[PDB]
Amino acid sequence: MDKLKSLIKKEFSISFEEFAVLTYISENKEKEYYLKDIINHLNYKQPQVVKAVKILSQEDYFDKKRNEHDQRTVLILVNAQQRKKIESLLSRVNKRITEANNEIELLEHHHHHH
């Protein structure tokens, strides 16, 4: 249902796909991540995941740098405050997805005949 993705894009200042990257990070709870591994877990292509990581890093969700032993590959870093920020977002987004499903159900229940 695209209306729910539009609601998340509008209200959370991040896309549903950007939210799925944070869900991936929130399930794994590692200190650092590879962008090729984000692509391996979420099949959006290289420029889409780089745009997602550029938006999310500017929104403070993770730190972003080229690797310490190789100057092309990336390290996406997650501090303890960022882990709490991500878990709090997942709680808020699941609650708001529940509210969005409930108002949809109330709009459908208006068809009370037949």
- Asked if 26 interacts with DNA (CB under 7 A), we say no
Strands (E), 1-114: 32-33, 63-66, 74-77
- Binding-site member from 70, 105, 109, 114 for DNA (CB under 7 A): 70
- Binding-site member from 21, 25, 53, 78 for DNA (CB under 7 A): 53
Give least dist CB 81 to DNA, A: 21
Angle at the Cα of 78 (from 72 to 82), degrees rounded to 5? 140
Q: What is the CA radius of gyration of the chain?
A: 17
- Asked if 81 interacts with DNA (CB under 7 A), we say no
71 vs 81, which CB is nearer to DNA?
Answer: 71
Give least dist CB 15 to DNA, A: 6
- Tell which residue, 69, 8, 62, 5, has the closest CA to residue 35: 62
